[PDB]
Amino acid sequence: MACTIQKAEALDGAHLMQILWYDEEESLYPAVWLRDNCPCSDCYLDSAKARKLLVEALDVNIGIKGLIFDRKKVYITWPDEHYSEFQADWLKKRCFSKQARAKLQRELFFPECQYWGSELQLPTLDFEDVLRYDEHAYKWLSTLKKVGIVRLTGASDKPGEVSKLGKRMGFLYLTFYGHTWQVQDKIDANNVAYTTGKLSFHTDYPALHHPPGVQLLHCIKQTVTGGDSEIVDGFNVCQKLKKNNPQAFQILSSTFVDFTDIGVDYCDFSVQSKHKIIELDDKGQVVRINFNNATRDTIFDVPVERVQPFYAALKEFVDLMNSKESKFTFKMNPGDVITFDNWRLLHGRRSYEAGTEISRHLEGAYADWDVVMSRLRILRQRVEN
Amino acid sequence: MACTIQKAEALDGAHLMQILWYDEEESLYPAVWLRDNCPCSDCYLDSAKARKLLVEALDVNIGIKGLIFDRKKVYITWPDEHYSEFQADWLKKRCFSKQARAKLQRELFFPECQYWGSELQLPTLDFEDVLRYDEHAYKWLSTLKKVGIVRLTGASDKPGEVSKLGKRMGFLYLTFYGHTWQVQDKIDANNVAYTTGKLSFHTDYPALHHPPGVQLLHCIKQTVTGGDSEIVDGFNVCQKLKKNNPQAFQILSSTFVDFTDIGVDYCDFSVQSKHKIIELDDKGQVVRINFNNATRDTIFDVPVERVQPFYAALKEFVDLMNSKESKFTFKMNPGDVITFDNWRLLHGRRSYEAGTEISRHLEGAYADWDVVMSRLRILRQRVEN
Ligand SMILES: C[N+]1(CCCC(=O)O)CCCC1
Ligand SMILES: C[N+]1(CCCC(=O)O)CCCC1
Ligand SMILES: O=C(O)CNC(=O)C(=O)O
Ligand SMILES: O=C(O)CNC(=O)C(=O)O
Ligand SMILES: NCCCCCCN
Ligand SMILES: NCCCCCCN
Ligand SMILES: [Zn+2]
Ligand SMILES: [Zn+2]
Ligand SMILES: [Zn+2]
Ligand SMILES: [Zn+2]
Numbered sequence: 055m056a057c058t059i060q061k062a063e064a065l066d067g068a069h070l071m072q073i074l075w076y077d078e079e080e081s082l083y084p085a086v087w088l089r090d091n092c093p094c095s096d097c098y099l100d101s102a103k104a105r106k107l108l109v110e111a112l113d114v115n116i117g118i119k120g121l122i123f124d125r126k127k128v129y130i131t132w133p134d135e136h137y138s139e140f141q142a143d144w145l146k147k148r149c150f151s152k153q154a155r156a157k158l159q160r161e162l163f164f165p166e167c168q169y170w171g172s173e174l175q176l177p178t179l180d181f182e183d184v185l186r187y188d189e190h191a192y193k194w195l196s197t198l199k200k201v202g203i204v205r206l207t208g209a210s211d212k213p214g215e216v217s218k219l220g221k222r223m224g225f226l227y228l229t230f231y232g233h234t235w236q237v238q239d240k241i242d243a244n245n246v247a248y249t250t251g252k253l254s255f256h257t258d259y260p261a262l263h264h265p266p267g268v269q270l271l272h273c274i275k276q277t278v279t280g281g282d283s284e285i286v287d288g289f290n291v292c293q294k295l296k297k298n299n300p301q302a303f304q305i306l307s308s309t310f311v312d313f314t315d316i317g318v319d320y321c322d323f324s325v326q327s328k329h330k331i332i333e334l335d336d337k338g339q340v341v342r343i344n345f346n347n348a349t350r351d352t353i354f355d356v357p358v359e360r361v362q363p364f365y366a367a368l369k370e371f372v373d374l375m376n377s378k379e380s381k382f383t384f385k386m387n388p389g390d391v392i393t394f395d396n397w398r399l400l401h402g403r404r405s406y407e408a409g410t411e412i413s414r415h416l417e418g419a420y421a422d423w424d425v426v427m428s429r430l431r432i433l434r435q436r437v438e439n
Numbered sequence: 440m441a442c443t444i445q446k447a448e449a450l451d452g453a454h455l456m457q458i459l460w461y462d463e464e465e466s467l468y469p470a471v472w473l474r475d476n477c478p479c480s481d482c483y484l485d486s487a488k489a490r491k492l493l494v495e496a497l498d499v500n501i502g503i504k505g506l507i508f509d510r511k512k513v514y515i516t517w518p519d520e521h522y523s524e525f526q527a528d529w530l531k532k533r534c535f536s537k538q539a540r541a542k543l544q545r546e547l548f549f550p551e552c553q554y555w556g557s558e559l560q561l562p563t564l565d566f567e568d569v570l571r572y573d574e575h576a577y578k579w580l581s582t583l584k585k586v587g588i589v590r591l592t593g594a595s596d597k598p599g600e601v602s603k604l605g606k607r608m609g610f611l612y613l614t615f616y617g618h619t620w621q622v623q624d625k626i627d628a629n630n631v632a633y634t635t636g637k638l639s640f641h642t643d644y645p646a647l648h649h650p651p652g653v654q655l656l657h658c659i660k661q662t663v664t665g666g667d668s669e670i671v672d673g674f675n676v677c678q679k680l681k682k683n684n685p686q687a688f689q690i691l692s693s694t695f696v697d698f699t700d701i702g703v704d705y706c707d708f709s710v711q712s713k714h715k716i717i718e719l720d721d722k723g724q725v726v727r728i729n730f731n732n733a734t735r736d737t738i739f740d741v742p743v744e745r746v747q748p749f750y751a752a753l754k755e756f757v758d759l760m761n762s763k764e765s766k767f768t769f770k771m772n773p774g775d776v777i778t779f780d781n782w783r784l785l786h787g788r789r790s791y792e793a794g795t796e797i798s799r800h801l802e803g804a805y806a807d808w809d810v811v812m813s814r815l816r817i818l819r820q821r822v823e824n
């Protein structure tokens with residue numbers, strides 16, 4: 055009844071098609087959009103699922119010349135004698151009502167979000183299961199999207215495990231630090247991460263204009279002298295900052311900060327960027343945090359009178375992250391892998407002691423959110439069918 | 440005189456340092472920023488050129504406790520007895536005056552832009568020269584940035600040339616179509632590009648939220664039956680659209696359009712995105728065009744009353760691109776490579792005839808603008824030294 059056609063007709067100077075469905079709901083489809091989306095082989099390349107029709111071929115003032123219909127299809131003639139068929143179910147899905155469009159957007163983009171603080175129960179799956187079973191890889195990526203982090207247990211204590219996860223998604227995101235990289239204390243370290251020091255809360259790689267969406271960290275070797283992990287939900291922290299100090303939130307969400315990274319690793323590099331630390335979409339919702347205090351430049355491209363208030367705002371933001379209500383602390387053991395949303399979470403680690411042999415070793419990599427979402431879309435289809 | 444210190448002193452409750460330079464110009468440096476940027480080994484990891492100092496260690500209300508200076512250095516004591524030295528030239532570069540900050544930003548980001556229409560003289564360099572000589576690779580990337588396109592002549596007529604250019608920059612940007620991809624007519628084509636049809640003006644890969652910054656196309660085989668190239672300067676076209684039809688510009692710069700790509704190539708994929716076709720920065724300047732009519736979805740996430748005006752705006756934009764004042768047409772020969780700014784230019788090709796053997800073959804690849812800019816920064820330093 056919902057997707058069965060009861061009536062179809064051209065309205066409003068034939069510039070609109072109205073479908074009355076058998077449940078008595080009505081849907082409206084502009085004629086220009088119908089013409090633009092003709093599925094015939096002249097207009098649409100089925101092997102590619104892509105539009106061949108050019109904007110140049112489209113009369114934006116077009117109207118329907120003739121229309122007949124049955125319960126499952128509409129058949130339209132156009133003014134220039136072009137001919138189109140549209141399926142009822144295809145039409146129903148693309149209904150222009152707010153409810154129908156929002157339902158479809160949810161299906162495409164998985165927007166459901168669960169914010170957390172120190173009460174987090176770390177979602178945990180088995181590593182080999184995720185590699186082997188679509189049901190498990192689906193739970194992995196969907197939970198990664200919703201919660202921002204999933205721990206995988208039972209990997210080996212050898213390099214190469216993040217690369218398996220990379221292939222499971224599709225491919226890893228290459229950067230100047232390599233396809234994968236080794237987190238260990240290094241002589242003449244080219245990054246603060248490659249020392250035994252504390253890492254305060256940061257996102258990785260704000261020196262890029264498109265920071266990595268998803269980060270993978272696999273514990274090969276752990277030390278008993280420190281090196282615990284800490285994470286925080288930046289979207290949760292931002293919400294609290296907006297509530298507690300709207301001025302601080304306004305400053306961090308509007309001030310461009312310069313980031314830098316110069317050195318040599320997989321290739322030689324001299325990287326510069328600008329980001330707002332709290333990055334809002336066109337509706338004022340936080341979509342990304344861009345903040346690593348190590349790679350924030352000495353160069354600061356603001357008028358002098360804005361400098362101290364910026365630092366005061368930043369300090370408030372960091373104090374919120376460190377609060378016992380926000381922060382979640384845990385320790386990785388050999389064989390553990392954490393996979394997390396590097397646009398949403400901030401992460402850190404406690405200092406540990408240096409010595410003459412390597413006491414601590416993580417292997418890490420990145421993936422692009424679009425690559426992850428693609429896999430998530432495919433998995434959902436496989437597991438629901 | 441300009442970078443020699445005549446006087447240094449703490450002002451405004453000791454919350455500011457003022458430098459009077461020997462040319463009588465004055466510079467102001469907030470004390471919090473000085474403390475934040477202490478170059479000592481406790482605060483700053485020289486091997487990484489990175490800040491070790493935590494936000495947590497920074498007193499945002501700090502003032503200078505004591506200061507002495509000579510012509511080339513300032514020496515500061517802080518309230519907690521921490522001690523800092525700053526070099527005159529380092530200070531001068533980071534002066535908070537608008538002029539000094541703007542000069543430095545120009546140096547970091549190469550913003551100079553030369554807009555063009557049908558009068559374009561295609562910048563052209565030799566392929567092997569660019570691989571061999573820093574002076575030539577510098578001209579290549581700087582011209583790529585400024586003009587949006589450079590042609591390279593004298594490459595081979597074999598696969599593998601774009602990969603050499605990839606290594607020259609640093610590395611190529613992997614996508615679902617491969618590290619490199621072959622533009623040829625293909626049975627069961629997964630993309631309109633892989634047919635003999637016309638490609639109207641488009642940017643590549645708006646189905647990704649971070650479309651490729653730079654595109655490389657190398658002509659291996661060309662056909663005499665058509666297959667000419669066309670390019671247009673989207674930033675130039677956008678400027679003209681804003682002048683001729685502000686309503687059309689407002690619509691295209693504010694309406695989110697859904698893009699899609701589903702299929703199988705280097706991996707299996709189901710990719711979805713949303714973009715404004717004309718993407719403005721926070722100041723209203725165009726920073727990216729996101730438009731491929733083939734991969735624009737049938738799904739269109741707008742209220743019905745916004746649909747036809749969107750199409751009317753799009754048609755006006757495309758008509759401007761096609762105008763004889765805007766468009767530049769040329770034909771690639773075997774051995775030619777074009778490298779262009781895929782965020783700024785739109786490109787297309789004329790249809791050609793199918794047949795039983797491959798009559799036309801391009802190899803293409805992408806690179807990230809941050810990767811290109813990094814190389815550009817390094818080259819400039821090498822060639823100026
Ligand atoms: C790629 N690595 C992180 C980049 C963090 C940052 O420089 O923002 C380099 C050090 C370990 C992982
Ligand atoms: C990577 N390729 C372009 C993508 C153009 C697009 O699908 O937006 C796939 C066809 C040839 C190059
Ligand atoms: O070493 C750790 O526990 C965490 N490392 C990082 O956050 C990093 O390398 O960027
Ligand atoms: O084939 C050409 O001349 C141009 N090709 C494309 O724009 C493409 O493959 O995306
Ligand atoms: N069942 C309706 C079929 C209409 C076909 C029209 C061909 N021009
Ligand atoms: N030339 C000035 C050197 C000052 C050194 C001070 C050490 N605390
Ligand atoms: Zn149905
Ligand atoms: Zn058709
Ligand atoms: Zn990190
Ligand atoms: Zn290299």
Ligand SMILES: [Zn+2]
Nearest residue numbers: 442443527528
């Ligand atoms: Zn000097």
Ligand SMILES: [Zn+2]
Nearest residue numbers: 477479481482
């Ligand atoms: Zn110091």
Ligand SMILES: [Zn+2]
Nearest residue numbers: 641642643786
């Ligand atoms: Zn293209």
Ligand SMILES: [Zn+2]
Nearest residue numbers: 224705706707
């Ligand atoms: Zn694959």
